[PDB]
Amino acid sequence: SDVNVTIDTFVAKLKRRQVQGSYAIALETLQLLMRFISAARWNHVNDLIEQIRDLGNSLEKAHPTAFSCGNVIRRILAVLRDEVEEDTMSTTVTSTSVAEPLISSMFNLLQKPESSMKTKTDYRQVAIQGIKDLIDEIKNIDEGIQQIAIDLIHDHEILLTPTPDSKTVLKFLITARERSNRTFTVLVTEGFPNNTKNAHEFAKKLAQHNIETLVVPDSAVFALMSRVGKVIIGTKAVFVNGGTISSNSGVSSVCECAREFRTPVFAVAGLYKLSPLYPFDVEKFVEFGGSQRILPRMDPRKRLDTVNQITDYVPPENIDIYITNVGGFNPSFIYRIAWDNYKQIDVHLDKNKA
Amino acid sequence: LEQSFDNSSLISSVKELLLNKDLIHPSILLLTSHLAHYKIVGSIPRCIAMLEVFQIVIKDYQTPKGTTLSRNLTSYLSHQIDLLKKARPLSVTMGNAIRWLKQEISLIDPSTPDKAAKKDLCEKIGQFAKEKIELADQLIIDNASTQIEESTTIVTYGSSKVLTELLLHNAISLKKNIKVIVVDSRPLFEGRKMAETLRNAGVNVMYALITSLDTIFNMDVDYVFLGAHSILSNGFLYSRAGTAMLAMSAKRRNIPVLVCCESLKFSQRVQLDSVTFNELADPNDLVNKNILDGWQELPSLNIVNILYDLTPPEYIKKVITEFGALPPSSVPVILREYKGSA
Amino acid sequence: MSEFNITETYLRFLEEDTEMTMPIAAIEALVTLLRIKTPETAAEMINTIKSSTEELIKSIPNSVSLRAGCDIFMRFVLRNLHLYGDWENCKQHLIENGQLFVSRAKKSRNKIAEIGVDFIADDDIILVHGYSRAVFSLLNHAANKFIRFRCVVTESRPSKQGNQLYTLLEQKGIPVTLIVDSAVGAVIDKVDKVFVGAEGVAESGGIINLVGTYSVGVLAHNARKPFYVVTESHKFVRMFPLSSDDLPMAGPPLDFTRRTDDLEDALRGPTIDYTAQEYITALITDLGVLTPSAVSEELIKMWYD
């Protein structure tokens, strides 16, 4: 149908990088998702999760290493996976409501025995607001960021980020200077040779808001690490270990060099930047780049080999906090926020339930 | 000036109020007089003493003519809290009780003839500290005792708050052999109150000072137990100053460290830096003709006196509450299951 | 007319097959305890097992994987008596659940082999230590998938189990060496991943299995390799130390009594070690992969009350 070709051009939108960043792909996968909601005839509530789980497997298998689209489809399933059990026990008579949100998850698989009366249409419209409330959360994640980080950071300390390609801290350190009138500086390195496009863009707009800033090269960041005692890292996605999928380049080893000086390592992440999946292989999520902008000569006869990398991964031992919209959290606590948003079935998002 | 922690404005030294719009309770001035001139509390001693004056001050209702008792006491009691804020900013042992009390102000209706206003509040706020404190401390006793063998040592820091009663139980109420190491610090010698008490109880007490801390650890030593002031949402122990130096050292010297604490001493807030959120207390105290005078008026001199400081949760091995024991990374899961829920 | 205590039910089927392991054998004995001996009253049923589990601890005091089996069976029959059936159906409603774990906890290990696939990746030299049979079934799935790897077996001294694992998978067809446990520290740099398995999980995440899993764990943390551990969802016990000292076998780990005639002198130290959360990094359940902080909360979620 007409919705079946808009997903195909959205499949075409996720092949050749027609959108980038952890922000804009999540809004555009979700506005496109509402077209599938408004033109679906499920006829059973377990068919509608079947209508969407294949669609994610038409998306995640189509492109794995994008995740702001990949975690919405599980979460918007989870708001309906909640309400299957809502209309289940309210249909029954004896034990209609206990309403405690947590049952012991170890024992639940280990005990197996074997007004809105029905209102079958409501799963559509509660996902129609489920379209809307997700985006309106995403529009102002920074208020929950800024409520806790000026609490967490203080006035007179030099700083450092390895991620200039983070529009969060690009917007956050404006009001971290503006409302809270704390004066400090930020060291800034380049994501050579990829975020150095934006690294020169980053401190220039901070030079407009004049936070004593100066650009360091990538090689020098150890030699000034003894002075700085606080680093913030604007990540791209985050998994269940507390090992996060960061931005493009250079940020993992300096996160390691920060950890060796017993320096606290900060990170910011929206709640929609969470992901209920596990990093089985680090190298199946570390995406590389091109031999073009790392040497442009292109010798065919000498013809050496060279390696680019446009994804860095850090262990959770090298990270300390998660400045989120709902508070700061341990690197090991990440499951409990995630399993309050995701379920154990659609994390193996695949038609073969082997 | 480079750190500018002297210009961290967590407290000032403002005093000398005169206002008489509110009918100020005279005895709640005595509580603030007993704190700020010379500190006589831990944290749950405050949570007793803050409750000691509250039962008295509600008994003098003095409800005006055109005002419901739900409408005045939310202003009347809360105006008296600002007297304490001039003396000493609150704890979570302060904080979790008073917001629970403000629930009880709100859940009453215009039906009470003010004779019934005592016993619906009095026993209820008595059954608060009967349950949340007293028999909460009873479950501390059996849990820690089975984790302590005979003929061992305990290293405490400062005045304890609940494990004084634990050390009384294992030395007298169970009579198993035990040696006690109490260390405190200049300026607040509150650990000497324990040093008086446990030898009045008749047990082997070795007093110590934090400058001589290594030679305690160079002997037969284990089971470092700690008092507490609040636990962060990460697992950081916000407690009395100088706690972490033994907490790093005993963890470095591979003998385990526990924190005796309770669910009332949890908190929703979170940080990871020692000098961010703290309190200073009257820098004249670290002087005692003296040796120096004039931190004021002299160029380039200042006296700091840190009260509270964070300990990394990796130093803490096991966190014991009234519900049981738990590893320190697993602190905030009770915040969704018991605190405001139990 | 049985009594279900020692061998009149229990030690019968421990000679039947060495595929069932120790705790679910106790679970198999505990579910058949109240099945035949169903004394038509909710009171003495649990008083029967409180008599029976505490003599079962008294039967073998130093197989505390059984104590985890003695732990969670009470956790089974508690919530199974919950749903409030007034013991009327709950006699049948328990035994219609009944044979769950001999149908479900027996398929722990293949379900571990369902989800423990993507840890042993392409060309991973694997360090194993001790016969934790869920590892071998994960390695059974690895050979049956024809995924490429190698294997290194340590000792298990004095428990001898490392000699079995070399014979157990060489016939399966894997390139493998048996190494002494003394030569871990000079070899671990070439080693990339390491798999062990606990007899029970403590409150912070415990490795309460063998003699030196904490020794190889603290090696791997300085080697900075992902110290994985393979277990399943019925291997949890409340028993939780503060040091690396659990209950020992019979005496303190530093004895100084002498040799009378010819007594064994390697068997003077402990046989069970402890590892806290710090040195593990991930574990496997039937519920899924599990971080060492979630293994604390699920061990406390139905354990405080």
Swiss-Prot record, chain A:
One Gene Ontology CC term in the entry: mitochondrion
Superkingdom of origin: Eukaryota
GO molecular function annotation: enzyme regulator activity; translation initiation factor activity
UniProt KW Nuclease keyword: no
GO BP of this protein: cytoplasmic translational initiation; regulation of translational initiation; translational initiation
Classification via Gene3D superfamilies: translation initiation factor eif-2b, domain 1, Translation initiation factor eif-2b, domain 2
Main subcellular location: cytoplasm
Compartments reported by the entry: Cytoplasm, Cytosol
Stretches that traverse the bilayer: none
Keywords: Cytoplasm, Initiation factor, Protein biosynthesis, Translation regulation
InterPro entries recorded: eIF2B_beta_subunit, IF-2B-related, IF_2B-like_C, M1Pi_N, NagB/RpiA_transferase-like
Entries under SUPFAM superfamilies matching the protein: NagB/RpiA/CoA transferase-like
Family to which the UniProt record says this protein belongs: Belongs to the eIF-2B alpha/beta/delta subunits family.
Record's function text: Acts as a component of the translation initiation factor 2B (eIF2B) complex, which catalyzes the exchange of GDP for GTP on the eukaryotic initiation factor 2 (eIF2) complex gamma subunit. Its guanine nucleotide exchange factor activity is repressed when bound to eIF2 complex phosphorylated on the alpha subunit, thereby limiting the amount of methionyl-initiator methionine tRNA available to the ribosome and consequently global translation is repressed.
Subunit structure: Component of the translation initiation factor 2B (eIF2B) complex which is a heterodecamer of two sets of five different subunits: alpha, beta, gamma, delta and epsilon. Subunits alpha, beta and delta comprise a regulatory subcomplex and subunits epsilon and gamma comprise a catalytic subcomplex. Within the complex, the hexameric regulatory complex resides at the center, with the two heterodimeric catalytic subcomplexes bound on opposite sides.
Further information: Present with 6650 molecules/cell in log phase SD medium.
Record's protein name: Translation initiation factor eIF2B subunit beta
Source organism per UniProt: Saccharomyces cerevisiae (strain ATCC 204508 / S288c) (Baker's yeast)
UniProtKB/Swiss-Prot annotation, chain B:
GO terms, biological process: cytoplasmic translational initiation; regulation of translational initiation
Location of the protein in the cell: Cytoplasm, Cytosol
Keyword Cytoplasm: yes
Keywords: Acetylation, Cytoplasm, Initiation factor, Phosphoprotein, Protein biosynthesis, Repressor, Translation regulation
Oligomeric form and interacting partners: Component of the translation initiation factor 2B (eIF2B) complex which is a heterodecamer of two sets of five different subunits: alpha, beta, gamma, delta and epsilon. Subunits alpha, beta and delta comprise a regulatory subcomplex and subunits epsilon and gamma comprise a catalytic subcomplex. Within the complex, the hexameric regulatory complex resides at the center, with the two heterodimeric catalytic subcomplexes bound on opposite sides.
Protein family per UniProt: Belongs to the eIF-2B alpha/beta/delta subunits family.
Misc. comment: Present with 10300 molecules/cell in log phase SD medium.
Protein name: Translation initiation factor eIF2B subunit delta
Organism: Saccharomyces cerevisiae (strain ATCC 204508 / S288c)
Gene, per the UniProt record: GCD2
Whole-protein residues included: 247 to 651 of 651
Swiss-Prot record, chain C:
Pfam families (alphabetical): IF-2B
Disruption phenotype: Inhibits GCN4 derepression in glucose, amino acid, or purine-starved cells.
Annotated positions of the Phosphothreonine modification: 291
Domain of life per record: Eukaryota
GO biological process, one term: positive regulation of cellular response to amino acid starvation
Gene Ontology cellular-component annotations: cytosol; eukaryotic translation initiation factor 2B complex; guanyl-nucleotide exchange factor complex
Protein name: Translation initiation factor eIF2B subunit alpha
Species of the source: Saccharomyces cerevisiae (strain ATCC 204508 / S288c)
Highest classification ranks of the organism: Eukaryota, Fungi, Dikarya, Ascomycota, Saccharomycotina
Gene of this entry: GCN3
